[PDB]
Amino acid sequence: LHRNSLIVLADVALFLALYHFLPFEHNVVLGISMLAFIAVLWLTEALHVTVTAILVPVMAVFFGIFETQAALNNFANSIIFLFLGGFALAAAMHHQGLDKVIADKVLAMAQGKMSVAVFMLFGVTALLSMWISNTATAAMMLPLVLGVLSKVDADKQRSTYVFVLLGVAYSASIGGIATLVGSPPNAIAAAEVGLSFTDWMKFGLPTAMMMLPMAIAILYFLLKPTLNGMFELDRAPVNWDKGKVVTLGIFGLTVFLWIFSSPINAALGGFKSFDTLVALGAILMLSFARVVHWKEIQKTADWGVLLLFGGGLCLSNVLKQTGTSVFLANALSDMVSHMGIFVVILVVATFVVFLTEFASNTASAALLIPVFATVAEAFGMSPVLLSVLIAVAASCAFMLPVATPPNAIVFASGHIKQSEMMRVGLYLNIACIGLLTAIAMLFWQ
């Protein structure tokens, strides 16, 4: 009766169809049928991301691909727990109020200029999206954006005030491309190809360093009239209280180990998922120091995303076990040989940066990383590059809303116009496809 209710039934039919008509070895048919089924569900999202993810293992088990416990073990992957540390790390400095004090101590640095205001709102958003989330950083930033945009409230000066709204929403997504925690897509890559925190930072951090300015400039060089305006510093001051230094200290300590995991771990015996152990040690320190209770983490934590990780890891394992990964690498063998690696990384980047416009960032990476990664292995190529690429290009949702939550968040402000974003993003999208392929090429040898 509902829209989504139909996709699910249409998708069940599409699966039943592909299943009974594809003319290949059953193992490959099964993998192809499953892949199409999930690919639709995750891209239309007729069912919640996590429900689809939970559907992966239950399918693999009934179709004899794996035994129940084998499939489920994907959900205990060490990266899933490193991402859980990121949440508890967030939950702490929010329940501590350390995220609000971070905004204030910065916005006061702008003595009163709207010029040095919106430009600080962008920087704060991207910085906070490195650790918290992207959807969460938007919701927590939007009021702070509408607050500053109330002295110069004249909305007939819209362009000063859609530049700020669209500015933060983009800063949230570009900030998430900075660290392994920040956006689910980044974790899906690390869990698929086994990346370290500092490994993904070698790639992501410089890219985010670059992409954030390139994105604001594009917004500036339309109708920016922000060189005018004044502030309305109405609010209670902040001050470092009980173990906000401790929390801030713990946090810094944790990020320190994450960055330096390589030598510290080697000089300790070479533990397995060292970054994961650090993330779990953070969860412990924060609780011994009493600075954050568990109910906080259970709320802050996105357990659906964690369940999702298991489904993508399970999906990747289904593609291999069924041989579908090699079956597809064959059908592309000629087509990809006609193409260089430049053409390859450029075609991929383009495909996702626009595919991610119609679906969630993570729901896109959840589907694309398993396929392209396992196929890249059939070609005997290291899936790091393609994976890292897809993870970054997935976070490049700038056109219409519905691409990322941060879009629909600043869009529900009833102030920015559909058409406006649809064309500012069409320019940014192209700028990224350029920047990405550039960086991707250099990140070759």
Q: Which residues lie near Na ion (CB under 5 A)?
A: 129, 131-133, 176, 182, 356, 360-361, 397, 403-404
Is residue 290 close enough to count as binding a copy of itself by CB under 8 A? yes
- Torsion angle in degrees (nearest 10) through CA of 177, 178, 184, 186: 80
**Nearer to a copy of itself (CB atom), residue 76 or residue 233:** 76
As given in the structure block, the two tokens for residue 378 are 């059939």
Question: Minimal distance in Å, beta carbon 381 to a copy of itself?
Answer: 25
**Nearer to Na ion (CB atom), residue 229 or residue 370:** 370
129 in a known ligand binding site: no
Binding mask 38-57 toward a copy of itself (x if CB under 8 A, else -) reads: ---------xxxxx--xx-x
* Distance separating alpha carbons of residues 445 and 440, to the nearest angstrom: 10
360 in a known ligand binding site: yes
Helices 244-259 & 78-95, crossing angle to 10 degrees?
Answer: 150
* Distance separating alpha carbons of residues 364 and 389, to the nearest angstrom: 13
5 in a known ligand binding site: no
**Nearer to Na ion (CB atom), residue 182 or residue 383:** 182
Is residue 8 close enough to count as binding a copy of itself by CB under 8 A? yes
Question: Minimal distance in Å, beta carbon 200 to Na ion?
Answer: 13
**Binding piece for a copy of itself, criterion CB under 8 A, among 28-36, 252-260, 283-291, 401-409:** 283-291
Binding-site member from 7, 35, 90, 283 for a copy of itself (CB under 8 A) = 283
Question: Minimal distance in Å, beta carbon 80 to a copy of itself?
Answer: 8
Residue pair 162/416 in contact (Cβ under 8 Å)? The answer is: yes
**Nearer to a copy of itself (CB atom), residue 39 or residue 121:** 39
**Nearer to Na ion (CB atom), residue 176 or residue 425:** 176
135 in a known ligand binding site: yes
From the list a copy of itself, Na ion, none, which binds 310 (C-beta under 5 to 8 Å, kind-based)? a copy of itself
From the list a copy of itself, Na ion, none, which binds 397 (C-beta under 5 to 8 Å, kind-based)? Na ion
Residue pair 397/174 in contact (Cβ under 8 Å)? The answer is: no
**Nearer to a copy of itself (CB atom), residue 173 or residue 276:** 276
265 in a known ligand binding site: no
Is residue 262 close enough to count as binding a copy of itself by CB under 8 A? no
Q: What are phi and psi of 176, to 5 degrees?
A: -65, -15
186 in a known ligand binding site: no
Binding mask 297-326 toward a copy of itself (x if CB under 8 A, else -) reads: -x--x-xx-----x----------------
CA terminus-to-terminus distance, the chain: 54
> Which residues contact residue 333 at a Cβ distance below 8 angstroms, ignoring those fewer than 6 apart?
none
**Nearer to a copy of itself (CB atom), residue 2 or residue 338:** 2
Is residue 246 close enough to count as binding a copy of itself by CB under 8 A? no
Return the residues of window 62-101 that contact a copy of itself according to CB under 8 A.
Answer: 62, 64, 67-69, 72-78, 81
> Which residues contact residue 117 at a Cβ distance below 8 angstroms, ignoring those fewer than 6 apart?
107, 110, 148, 229, 231
Binding residues for fumarate: 134-135, 183, 361-362
